[PDB]
Amino acid sequence: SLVTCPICHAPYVEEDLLIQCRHCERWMHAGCESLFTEDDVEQAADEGFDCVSCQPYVVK
Amino acid sequence: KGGAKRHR
Ligand SMILES: [Zn+2]
Ligand SMILES: [Zn+2]
């Protein structure tokens, strides 16, 4: 899913760039995951990115 | 999707 950010509680906008979990495919903004830039997001994606529940369950 | 996304 994309058209809701459960981290922000759904005040969705297209202006902030996004990243997704490799397992769940759910999208979230860079800022609600403390990622600074599009390049930091590309680095985080190349590292094999994870959503909020995937931190305890399957991190990296 | 492609891990990263930006509109536009
Ligand atoms: Zn968010
Ligand atoms: Zn996940």
Q: Is the dihedral of CA A8, B2, A21, A26 positive or negative?
A: positive
Taking the CA atoms of A23, A60, A58 and A19 in sequence, report the sign of the dihedral they define.
Answer: negative
Method: NMR
Are A17 and B3 inside 8 Å of each other by CB? no
d(CA A9, CA A38): 22
A26 CA → ligand 1 middle, Å:
11
All residues of chain B having their beta carbon less than 8 Å from the beta carbon of residue A40 are none
Q: Which CATH superfamily is domain A1-60 in?
A: Zinc/RING finger domain, C3HC4 (zinc finger) (3.30.40.10)
Ion ligand 2: residue ranges with CB closer than 5 A: A 21, 23-24, 51, 54
- Among all bound ligands, the one having the nearest atom to the CA of A27 is 1
Q: Where are the alpha helices (DSSP H) in A1-60?
A: 38-46, 54-58
Domain residues of chain A, as ranges? Answer: 1-60
